C-alpha cells in the first residue's frame, strides 16, 4: 500500500529536537547543509534512526538514578546514571545515547523532581546546570550512561537519591553541534543529513528554545528534518519502499494552492529545489501529501521568491 | 462493509505521550475507587477523529498556553502577569464551542508555569521566569481569554511586555476537577466520560506530575482516556463509524499472550469489565489491536 502522510498542518505539529510546537517552515542555504541531528531521524520504512524517540515528551529529556552530594565551591552536584525514559535498562549500543537525549550543545538548565529531608517543600522542582559539551572538563558520557549537573548553593540541599525525569528549562550558549557523547571518543551516529542533488536544500521545521542570554533578545532557532508526528506515523505504518524518494506537494486545503513540491528521501529528510542565497519561509498552514515514488535524480520544480 | 476498518497505531502504552500533562504514559490501570465519569477536556477525541473539548493535536500543547503578557508590580501580591490568551500557534482565541484555548489545563490547584521574559536590567536581557497560577477549582477567565499569575517579590522584576508560551513546571494542591473556566459561569464542555455498562470501568493511561508538597507523599497521578498518539491517529484517519463500540484486544507481541479485551466507545473512552475492589494495573508493553465493531450492550470477559 502507498505511503501517505498525516493530514496535519506544520503549525499544529510537535518539534522533534526541542519539546515545543513547530512555529516555522523554511529553507536557508546559508545554514550548515548536512547536519548530524540525532533526534527527529526516521527512515520512511518507519525505522527510528539515531536517538530518535516515539513520544515528543522524550525529546531533549532524560531519565536517571540521581546521586546527589554537596561540594564546597561548586554547590549541589547531581551524578545521573541514565536509564531509557520508560525505565528500561540503558545499554551502550547502536546509537550515541539514550533515546531522546539532547543532540545539541551549550549549557542546558534542566528540571527534576527533588525530595529533601529539610523543612518546607519536601518535594519541589530543582533547576540544575548541565554542560552538554564538547568541553575540556564537561566529562559527560551519556553514551556510557553517566552525566553530571550542578546548582550553586551555600550548603547541602539534603536531597534524597532516587529516580528522576529531567526536562529542559532553557539553553545558554546554544550551538547546533552534537554534544560530548563519550568523553571525547567516537560513538555510533545517524549519518549527516543528505545527500542533495545540485540546487536542492534541506526543508527546516523550526521552533524557538527558552534561552538565557545576557545581551541579545532575538529568539534562538532550532531546526529538525520532520515533525515528531511524521516519526510516529512512519514508525506505526511500516510502509514498503518502492524507490529512493517520495515526491510531495505542500498544498493549502481551503484554496487548493500548490505552494511547492519536494522530495522526502527514504533516509527521512525533505529537499526543495531553491536557488536563492538567503532564507525563504513558507506558510505553516498547508498540508504535505504524497504524489508518488520517484528516483534519486528526479528534478523538482524550483520554488520562487 | 465497503468501509475501511478502524485500526490503532502499533505503539506500546509506555512509549506514548500523556494527553493531560506533557509527560510519558507510565501506567495503565482501572481503579473503581476514582471518579467513574470524569469531565476531562483534553485527551477527548471521537473515534471519527473529531477533537472534543480543548484537546489539541500536539502533545507540546497539553497543559500549556500562549498569550500576550502584561507585567506589573502589585502591592499585596508581587510581580503580576496578565495573560491575554491566544491559541498556541498564534491564531486568535475567540470564545466558542469549548471551555478555553486548545491544551489549556483541565484540572485544579496552583500551577507553577515558566515563560521567557526580557528584562531592562543590564547583564540580564533574556531569562526564564516562574509564576504561580491558581487554576481553581475557584478571577481566572480562560474562556474569555484572560488569566493571571504572580510571583512574591520585594519590588518590580523590570519585565518587558510581549508574547509568551507558558509550560508547566509543577502542580501544588492538585485536584482532578475542571478549573474556573468563566468566573463561575457555564461554558461549552466535552460531556462527562461514559456511560458504562454494569460492571464496566474506565481504562486509565497514567502519568505523574512534578509537584510541590510540604508533606513529602508519593507521586501525583493524573489519568487520561487515550494517549495523544491515539488522538492524532483518529484525527488524521477519519474512520467511518459502523456501531457504538470497538472490541479491542491488549496483547503482548513477543509472547502472543492476550492480557484483556475491552470496548473503545465512539466518544473516545475504553471500558473493561472489572468488579474487584482495589486498583488493577496492567503491563505497559502490550499493543491494542482492533477486533470488530460491537454493539453498546456487548458483554466483555471480566479481568
Amino acid at each position, epitope marked *: 500500500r502507498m505511503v501517505d502522510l498525516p*493530514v*496535519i*498542518q506544520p503549525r*499544529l505539529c510537535t518539534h522533534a529536537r526541542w519539546p515545543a510546537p513547530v512555529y516555522g517552515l523554511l529553507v536557508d542555504p546559508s545554514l550548515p547543509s548536512n547536519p548530524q541531528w540525532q533526534n527527529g531521524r526516521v527512515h520512511v520504512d518507519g525505522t527510528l534512526l539515531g536517538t530518535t524517540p516515539i513520544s515528543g515528551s522524550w525529546v531533549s529529556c532524560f531519565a536517571a538514578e540521581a546521586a546527589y552530594k554537596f561540594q564546597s565551591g561548586t554547590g549541589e552536584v547531581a551524578t545521573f546514571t541514565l536509564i531509557e525514559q520508560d525505565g528500561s535498562a540503558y545499554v551502550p549500543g547502536d546509537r550515541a545515547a539514550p533515546l531522546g537525549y539532547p543532540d545539541f550543545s551549550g549549557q542546558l538548565e534542566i528540571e527534576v523532581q527533588t525530595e529533601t529531608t529539610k523543612t518546607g517543600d519536601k518535594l519541589k522542582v530543582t533547576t540544575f546546570e548541565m554542560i552538554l559539551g564538547p568541553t575540556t572538563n564537561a566529562d559527560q558520557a551519556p553514551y556510557q550512561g553517566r552525566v553530571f549537573a550542578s546548582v550553586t548553593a551555600a550548603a547541602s540541599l539534603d536531597l534524597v537519591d532516587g529516580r528522576v525525569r529531567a526536562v529542559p528549562r532553557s539553553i545558554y550558549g546554544f550551538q547546533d553541534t552534537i554534544p560530548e557523547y563519550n568523553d571525547g571518543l567516537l560513538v555510533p551516529l545517524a549519518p549527516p543529513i543528505g545527500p542533495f542533488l545540485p540546487g536542492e536544500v534541506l526543508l527546516r521545521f523550526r521552533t524557538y528554545m527558552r534561552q538565557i542570554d545576557t545581551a541579545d533578545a532575538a529568539a534562538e532557532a532550532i531546526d529538525c528534518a520532520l515533525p515528531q508526528e511524521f516519526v510516529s506515523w512512519f514508525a506505526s505504518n511500516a510502509f514498503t519502499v518502492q524507490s529512493e524518494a517520495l515526491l510531495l506537494r505542500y498544498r493549502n*486545503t*481551503l*484554496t*487548493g494552492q500548490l505552494l511547492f513540491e519536494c522530495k522526502l528521501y527514504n533516509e527521512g529528510y525533505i529537499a526543495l529545489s531553491y536557488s536563492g542565497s538567503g532564507p525563504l519561509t513558507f506558510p505553516t498552514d498547508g498540508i504535505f501529501e504524497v504524489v508518488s515514488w520517484v528516483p534519486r535524480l528526479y528534478q523538482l520544480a524550483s520554488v520562487g521568491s | 462493509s465497503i468501509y475501511r476498518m478502524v485500526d490503532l497505531p502499533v505503539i506500546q502504552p509506555r512509549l506514548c505521550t500523556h494527553a493531560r500533562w506533557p509527560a510519558p504514559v507510565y501506567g495503565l490501570l482501572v481503579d473503581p475507587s476514582l471518579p467513574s465519569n470524569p469531565q476531562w477536556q483534553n485527551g477527548r477525541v*471521537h473515534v*471519527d*477523529g*473529531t*477533537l*472534543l473539548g480543548t484537546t*489539541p*493535536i500536539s502533545g507540546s500543547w497539553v497543559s500549556c498556553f500562549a498569550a500576550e503578557a502584561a507585567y506589573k508590580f502589585q502591592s499585596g501580591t508581587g510581580e503580576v502577569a496578565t495573560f491575554t490568551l491566544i*491559541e498556541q500557534d498564534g*491564531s486568535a482565541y*475567540v*470564545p*466558542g*464551542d469549548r471551555a478555553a484555548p*486548545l491544551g489549556y489545563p483541565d484540572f485544579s490547584g496552583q500551577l507553577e508555569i515558566e515563560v521567557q521574559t526580557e528584562t531592562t536590567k543590564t547583564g540580564d536581557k533574556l531569562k526564564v521566569t516562574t509564576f504561580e497560577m491558581i487554576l481553581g477549582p475557584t478571577d481566572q477567565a480562560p474562556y474569555q481569554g484572560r488569566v493571571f499569575a504572580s510571583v512574591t517579590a520585594a519590588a518590580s522584576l523590570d519585565l518587558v511586555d510581549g508574547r509568551v508560551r507558558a509550560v508547566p513546571r509543577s502542580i501544588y494542591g492538585f485536584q482532578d476537577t475542571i478549573p474556573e473556566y468563566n468566573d463561575g459561569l*457555564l461554558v*461549552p464542555l*466535552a*460531556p462527562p466520560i461514559g456511560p458504562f455498562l454494569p460492571g464496566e470501568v474506565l481504562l486509565r493511561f497514567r502519568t505523574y506530575m512534578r509537584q510541590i508538597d510540604t508533606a513529602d507523599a508519593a507521586a501525583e497521578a493524573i489519568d487520561c482516556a487515550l494517549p495523544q498518539e491515539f488522538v492524532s491517529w483518529f*484525527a488524521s484517519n*477519519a474512520f*467511518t*463509524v459502523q456501531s457504538e463500540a470497538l472490541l479491542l484486544r491488549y496483547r503482548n507481541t513477543l509472547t502472543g499472550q492476550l492480557l484483556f479485551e475491552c470496548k473503545l466507545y*465512539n*466518544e473516545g473512552y475504553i471500558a473493561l469489565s472489572y468488579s474487584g475492589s482495589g486498583p488493577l494495573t496492567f503491563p505497559t508493553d502490550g499493543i491494542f489491536e482492533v477486533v470488530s465493531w460491537v454493539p453498546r450492550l456487548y458483554q466483555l470477559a471480566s479481568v
Partner: nanobody
Amino acid sequence: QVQLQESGGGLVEAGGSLRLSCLGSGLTFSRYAMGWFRQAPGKEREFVASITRSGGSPNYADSVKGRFTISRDNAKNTVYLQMSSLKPEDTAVYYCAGRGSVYYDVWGQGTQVTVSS
C-alpha cells in the same frame, strides 16, 4: 474552492420554528466537524451548536439547549439546524462553519433570522 452555502432563514413568529441547511462543495464533507454560529446585531459572533464528522456528540450553547437540534446528512454534504420555540433574542445572522482539524476555518456567508414579538 472549499465553500459552504446556508439557506432557510426568514421572518418567523415567536414560539415558531424553521430549519437552516448548509451545503458543502469542493471538500470531503465527512472529514469536517460542523457548527452553527450567529451574530445578533450589536453583539459578538457566538456559538450555537456543534456536531462531529459522523454526526455524533451534538453540543449546544446553554441559551438554545432543548430548542435547537443540529444534525447532518453526509451523503448530501449537508448540515442542518432545527430552530424551535423561537425567541426575539434568536434574531441574528446564522453562519455554518467547518472544522477540518482544530479550527473553524471555513464559513458560509450567513442567512438572516428575524423572530417577530
